[PDB]
Symmetry: C3
Subunit: 200 residues, 3 copies
């Protein structure tokens, strides 16, 4: 029994930076209509918090992104977040997450970073920034030598990258914000498309 089961099932994790006019509930529905029931609200704006609050009942597995301290981590959880994400590994955020019994996906890049995370009992890791660092080819090398790690790649991933990611066996989901630009029929399309480019 997996707490990231929803995540594993989408294979897809949109990220959202709130500018404050978004139709959140609208978005929520489209996402869940399309087979994608997780979403990540970045805390790069205080409105990211208000948006977790607003989406609490939405039925989405909600993630909090850019969580950069134990306090920001606590705040996210009290806002409705079910999992935490940060760009690099914060041991103190992992201590908060294990304390509250919620999943924490620290970002990693190097094999050494992978061991360090593993050493904290974390085996579901962000890979960030994925595109500049050659996500697909890197996660292919980690499939062999880290057979126990699942990865959440994010960072500059475009649609055309998807079929390459879909062939990897150590893939938890692919993250991005690219999915979410446009209007509700726009976003739906992109989601439906990325959903299809993964598992063909």
């Amino acid at each position: 029994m997996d707490p990231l089961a929803v995540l594993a099932e989408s294979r897809l994790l949109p990220l959202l930076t709130v500018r404050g006019g978004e139709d959140l509930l609208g978005l929520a529905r489209v996402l869940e209509e399309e087979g994608v029931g997780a979403l990540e609200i970045t805390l790069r704006t205080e409105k990211g918090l208000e948006a977790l609050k607003a989406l609490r009942k939405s039925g989405l597995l909600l993630g909090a992104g850019t969580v950069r301290s134990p306090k920001e981590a606590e705040a996210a959880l009290e806002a409705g977040a079910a999992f935490l994400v940060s760009p690099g590994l914060l041991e103190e955020v992992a201590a908060l997450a294990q304390a509250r019994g919620v999943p924490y996906l620290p970002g990693v890049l190097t094999p050494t970073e992978v061991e360090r995370a593993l050493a904290l009992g974390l085996s579901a890791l962000k890979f960030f920034p994925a595109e500049p660092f050659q996500g697909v080819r890197v996660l292919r090398a980690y499939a062999e030598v880290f057979p126990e790690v699942r990865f959440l790649p994010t960072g500059g991933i475009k649609e055309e990258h998807l079929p390459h990611y879909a062939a990897l066996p150590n893939l938890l989901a692919v993250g991005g914000s690219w999915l979410l630009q446009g209007n509700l029929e726009a976003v739906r399309a992109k989601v439906r498309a990325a959903k299809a480019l993964l598992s063909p």
Copy 2:
């Protein structure tokens, strides 16, 4: 009030490996004539020290590069250096730098490395080796999630890379040695050119 103000103003930081026949004072003048008042002398040769001594009165903001230990760091400062640079983060060099109240730009690459530096109160970071690691695309991802960090990219950067770097908002200066190959009218040209390719 910024101790790296000169650096921010050039946007450009040449690096120099002394082979011992260079016209340092000549070079100094050309640099300052061209809007570029900082320069980095690498300590890959003992003559790097003699060159800091020689350039002490030049009016250049002088940096010491490849500083790989607290002692090498002290020596650089007694030679006339106003800021220290190393290829990776050395906590003990940061302790020497905070002790002497001078700027230290540790090299970083990964998000995790970025946090670790930040945790030492360092928010002006080397990004090295920039070109192999896709400097521009990486620093673009860090602009969003590390909005408080300024970066000094160095390592294999060529002229043609500049206009891409110039559009980033988290750029302290671009470093390189490529600027400094040739003769005084040669170097001047390259400096004038890189100076122009940045901010268009």
Copy 3:
């Protein structure tokens, strides 16, 4: 006097994942016939152990790869391994290796990782995953600022990459499994070829 002298002499280090039907002694002979007297058996399968046992008398400098804990490290050594390799740096594996007086080549990628290894007295380092991370261009930047480190690049390296690696001055050997796919006359060819593409 160098314990990795054989390694330095091949310039080439095949890696082998045992599926359990291989002609090990056959392979051994071909390797040593071809100027290549080191070989790396990955511990991604328990049969990797049986293969170290089987090759103990072969006259090969045998390495153990994917060693991810002090215990796995001990086991490898009792199986006949003369050197240890892991994808990232494990301090506890380095303590086992220094205890038993055998070489340990932790994998590294970043300048900071390089210092950390150096700080443990390790100056022969794996560079992994080499190809996604632009091995050649990265090891070229490290040649200047880490003039004391020799590197063992591995990870997605193909034949055509070799002449670029061969020009670097800080190269201990290039690792890969690509060398070992096929049949004994097949493998021989690939070895003879990679051996030649290095030092021309």
